[PDB]
Amino acid sequence: MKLLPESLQQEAATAAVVASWVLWHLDTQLLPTIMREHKLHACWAAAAKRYNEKLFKLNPSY
Amino acid sequence: MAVTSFLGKAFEKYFYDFSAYEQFGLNRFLSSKGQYVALRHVGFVMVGVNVLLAANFPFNPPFPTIGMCPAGWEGTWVCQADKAKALEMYKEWKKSN
Amino acid sequence: AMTRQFSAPGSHEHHETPLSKVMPTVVSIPRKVACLALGATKKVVCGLASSGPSQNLVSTFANKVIVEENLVNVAEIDVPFWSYWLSSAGFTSKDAFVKFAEAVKPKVAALSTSDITNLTVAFKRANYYDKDLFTGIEANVSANFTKFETEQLLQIVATFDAFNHSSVAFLDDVADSITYCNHYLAPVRAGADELATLLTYYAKNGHERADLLATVARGFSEVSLGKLSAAQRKDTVLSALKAFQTFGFYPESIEAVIGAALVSPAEYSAEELKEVEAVKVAAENALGGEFVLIQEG
Amino acid sequence: SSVRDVKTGSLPTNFLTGVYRFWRSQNPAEKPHDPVNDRLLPAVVDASDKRASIGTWATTFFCTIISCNLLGLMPFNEAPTSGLGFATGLGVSVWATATILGLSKTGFKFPGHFIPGGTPWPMAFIFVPLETISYTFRAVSLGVRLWVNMLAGHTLLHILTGMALALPFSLGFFSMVPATFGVCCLLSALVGLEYLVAVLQSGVFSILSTVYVGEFNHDKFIGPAAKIVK
Amino acid sequence: RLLKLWAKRLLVSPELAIVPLNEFDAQLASKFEGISPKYQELLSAVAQGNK
Amino acid sequence: EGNSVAGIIKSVNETSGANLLSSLKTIKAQAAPIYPAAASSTGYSTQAKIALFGALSWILYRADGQSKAHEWIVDLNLNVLQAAWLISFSSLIPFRAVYFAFRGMAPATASTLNGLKTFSSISL
Numbered sequence: 001m002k003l004l005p006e007s008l009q010q011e012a013a014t015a016a017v018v019a020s021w022v023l024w025h026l027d028t029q030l031l032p033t034i035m036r037e038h039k040l041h042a043c044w045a046a047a048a049k050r051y052n053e054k055l056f057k058l059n060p061s062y
Numbered sequence: 063m064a065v066t067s068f069l070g071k072a073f074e075k076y077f078y079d080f081s082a083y084e085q086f087g088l089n090r091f092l093s094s095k096g097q098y099v100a101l102r103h104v105g106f107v108m109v110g111v112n113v114l115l116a117a118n119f120p121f122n123p124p125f126p127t128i129g130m131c132p133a134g135w136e137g138t139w140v141c142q143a144d145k146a147k148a149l150e151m152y153k154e155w156k157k158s159n
Numbered sequence: 160a161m162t163r164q165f166s167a168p169g170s171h172e173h174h175e176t177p178l179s180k181v182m183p184t185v186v187s188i189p190r191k192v193a194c195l196a197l198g199a200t201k202k203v204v205c206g207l208a209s210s211g212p213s214q215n216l217v218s219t220f221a222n223k224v225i226v227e228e229n230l231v232n233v234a235e236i237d238v239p240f241w242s243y244w245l246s247s248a249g250f251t252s253k254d255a256f257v258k259f260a261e262a263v264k265p266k267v268a269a270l271s272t273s274d275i276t277n278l279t280v281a282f283k284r285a286n287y288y289d290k291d292l293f294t295g296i297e298a299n300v301s302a303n304f305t306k307f308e309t310e311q312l313l314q315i316v317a318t319f320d321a322f323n324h325s326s327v328a329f330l331d332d333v334a335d336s337i338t339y340c341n342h343y344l345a346p347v348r349a350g351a352d353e354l355a356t357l358l359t360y361y362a363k364n365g366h367e368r369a370d371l372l373a374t375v376a377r378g379f380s381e382v383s384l385g386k387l388s389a390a391q392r393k394d395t396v397l398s399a400l401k402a403f404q405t406f407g408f409y410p411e412s413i414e415a416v417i418g419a420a421l422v423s424p425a426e427y428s429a430e431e432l433k434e435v436e437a438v439k440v441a442a443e444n445a446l447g448g449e450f451v452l453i454q455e456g
Numbered sequence: 457s458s459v460r461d462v463k464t465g466s467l468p469t470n471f472l473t474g475v476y477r478f479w480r481s482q483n484p485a486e487k488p489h490d491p492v493n494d495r496l497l498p499a500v501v502d503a504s505d506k507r508a509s510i511g512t513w514a515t516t517f518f519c520t521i522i523s524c525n526l527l528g529l530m531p532f533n534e535a536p537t538s539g540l541g542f543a544t545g546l547g548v549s550v551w552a553t554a555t556i557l558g559l560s561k562t563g564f565k566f567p568g569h570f571i572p573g574g575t576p577w578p579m580a581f582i583f584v585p586l587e588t589i590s591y592t593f594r595a596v597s598l599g600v601r602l603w604v605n606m607l608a609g610h611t612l613l614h615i616l617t618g619m620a621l622a623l624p625f626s627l628g629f630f631s632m633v634p635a636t637f638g639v640c641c642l643l644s645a646l647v648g649l650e651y652l653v654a655v656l657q658s659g660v661f662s663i664l665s666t667v668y669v670g671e672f673n674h675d676k677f678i679g680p681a682a683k684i685v686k
Numbered sequence: 687r688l689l690k691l692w693a694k695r696l697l698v699s700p701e702l703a704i705v706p707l708n709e710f711d712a713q714l715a716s717k718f719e720g721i722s723p724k725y726q727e728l729l730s731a732v733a734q735g736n737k
Numbered sequence: 738e739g740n741s742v743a744g745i746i747k748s749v750n751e752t753s754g755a756n757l758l759s760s761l762k763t764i765k766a767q768a769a770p771i772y773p774a775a776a777s778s779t780g781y782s783t784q785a786k787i788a789l790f791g792a793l794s795w796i797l798y799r800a801d802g803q804s805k806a807h808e809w810i811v812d813l814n815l816n817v818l819q820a821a822w823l824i825s826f827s828s829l830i831p832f833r834a835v836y837f838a839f840r841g842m843a844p845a846t847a848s849t850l851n852g853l854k855t856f857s858s859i860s861l
Contacts, residue, residue: 023513112624
């Protein structure tokens with residue numbers, strides 16, 4: 001059967017290229033989008049208690 | 063063009079609306095619908111196997127047959143073990159036929 | 160054979176290094192490792208060659224590139240671009256910077272935040288002051304303070320501190336941008352030397368902004384102060400403590416500033432240590448506690 | 457220059473989000489002794505800088521390997537990880553990456569971590585050399601395990617398919633069905649196992665990376681050198 | 687002028703009409719978490735709209 | 738483009754009390770957020786056509802090599818065995834349940850957006 005390829009360096013360079021592109025794409029395209037959506041909800045959920053209280057102290061509407 | 067949009071609408075109805083399990087009423091015989099699809103796949107496999115083999119039956123098998131023959135040949139180039147000799151025997155048979 | 164016989168005891172002694180002196184005796188007085196660290200340091204000290212005479216050669220290039228208006232109209236293209244790299248190479252000529260200010264003044268209103276920052280940093284290295292140019296710059300910043308970044312504003316403010324120039328509208332717009340229009344953790348990436356410059360600028364102007372002070376104080380830490388030179392660290396501490404004492408604001412993070420001085424008091428004089436402890440007791444009364452030094456172990 | 461717009465709540469985004477959170481959870485941050493506040497925040501940021509980006513790295517390897525493995529299960533396609541150099545190169549790159557990381561911060565003390573904790577100090581000598589070989593053996597075994605799975609599964613399917621095809625070829629296509637039916641079920645179940653193996657191998661590889669690199673993802677907390685108590 | 691005042695509120699936030707003006711004071715409390723939940727959940731749901 | 742709230746305030750302040758109630762429905766629509774209408778129907782995008790051509794070309798290139806390969810018949814039968822599982826997954830997988838499963842993975846979509854409350858933003 002086929003055991004050894006025609007070039008080991010060629011196969012390794014291919015894998016490294018693909019992995020490097022995925023890493024760049026993740027940091028440059030995926031993570032910024034994910035964090036924009038994820039952190040929006042998380043900040044509101046974490047601040048809702050202190051945010052509403054601070055606002056309640058500021059408006060003289062009551 | 064329209065011809066492509068039409069096929070999209072048609073395939074949707076086939077995927078969701080058209081079910082042979084209901085139109086043939088196989089619920090009378092089969093236990094569960096989840097098991098019916100399993101049998102349909104094994105049938106598809108057996109169908110594909112026979113279809114691919116029928117596409118060109120007169121050929122020497124690359125796989126090692128375990129002492130068995132296809133038809134009333136048993137000694138034709140189709141049944142030769144060594145492919146180097148089989149190629150010569152097939153060429154003679156092919157120029158005749 | 161003999162190679163393995165020698166290799167085994169060679170590694171044996173190397174295995175003693177990762178121990179809190181578990182064996183009877185391992186730690187040594189000579190401490191040869193000090194030589195290795197100092198050896199590497201000597202090389203970088205030489206690398207820091209200033210090449211001052213070459214600055215004249217760079218001046219020649221500058222004069223034979225942009226200064227001869229016969230080749231290219233200086234006012235037509237991008238003053239912030241060329242001036243940024245020219246000052247980076249050490250070309251600081253007041254006469255050329257005068258041409259630059261007149262060439263850029265009609266365009267300042269259309270410059271981006273990055274261009275404004277680089278242009279301002281260039282004038283800091285040149286130590287050249289143009290009141291009319293800084294007026295247009297501060298108007299741009301005040302109009303778009305939400306778009307500017309703390310890393311940029313810290314460099315800009317440093318220029319406003321080199322030459323005493325301030326505006327009440329500018330002071331508030333900058334404080335609001337750093338306190339609310341930027342990330343509250345940005346000072347950690349800023350560096351204590353830039354933070355002390357900003358503090359001194361507001362302290363000399365008497366502009367009290369407790370919200371700004373609470374934000375800037377987060378940047379001061381053992382990690383950020385440890386990265387500065389011993390001389391720069393001393394000057395940074397002595398200037399930062401004066402600003403805190405001026406406004407009477409004593410955040411909890413001030414203890415890292417004081418600890419940096421008390422861990423190495425040999426660099427400070429008696430009069431410097433006296434005012435340091437004066438702030439220490441003032442902060443101890445404000446925070447309601449007692450100062451104690453922490454030791455590793 | 458003009459970036460595209462993205463719909464919030466997109467299915468690919470949500471899937472990738474949970475994947476990152478899952479791998480990031482594999483290496484949780486150590487809880488400091490002191491209460492986390494404005495005084496401790498800069499030290500926590502420093503700890504994050506000292507921490508490696510394993511979560512980013514692990515998800516990168518997971519997605520790139522699972523994609524290559526799934527390609528081997530698509531018709532008219534082969535898995536890139538079936539090539540010896542392709543699969544092994546990833547394992548060596550992981551092992552080399554962890555090695556370089558450890559040698560950077562701790563340097564000469566890196567051979568130190570190799571010592572097993574709680575070992576009697578006189579006995580230790582004979583232990584670390586074997587563990588050193590085991591550490592270097594990870595470079596091979598990590599990549600070979602992935603490669604063998606992609607190779608042996610495809611080769612096994614090849615041999616078994618040849619043996620299965622001999623039945624309808626010898627006993628007629630539509631003459632008799634029960635003998636070929638039973639072998640078709642076994643083959644169908646093997647392909648189903650290959651799909652699971654692809655998910656298992658991509659997970660195992662990423663898990664092992666989080667374990668090995670996590671071994672050196674530890675540093676002493678630069679806590680407050682001075683404190684005002686009470 | 688009073689009509690114009692309320693029009694601005696109801697155009698942006700029409701769900702205020704579900705709580706009568708005379709009952710508004712009976713909901714207030716010194717802390718935001720102390721507010722009566724009688725209308726809290728209802729306002730949050732109506733705020734999402736007709737769908 | 739100015740903010741819609743400022744447009745409402747100006748429009749309401751400038752409108753007469755007599756035509757206030759009748760014009761409220763118009764002001765409400767004038768401040769409604771833009772929802773782009775459906776554009777003209779296009780069969781396929783330019784990039785989509787390239788994707789189909791590339792996928793077909795790759796398939797044909799691989800199929801041609803497999804047919805010319807040794808044990809070529811085995812390769813073609815392996816493709817059938819694999820293709821059967823693709824049909825099985827499309828039939829067995831409860832995509833609606835799976836959609837909620839992935840939606841439940843991310844905290845931003847596993848729960849509703851809990852934030853600003855009405856009582857805190859009342860403008861009286």
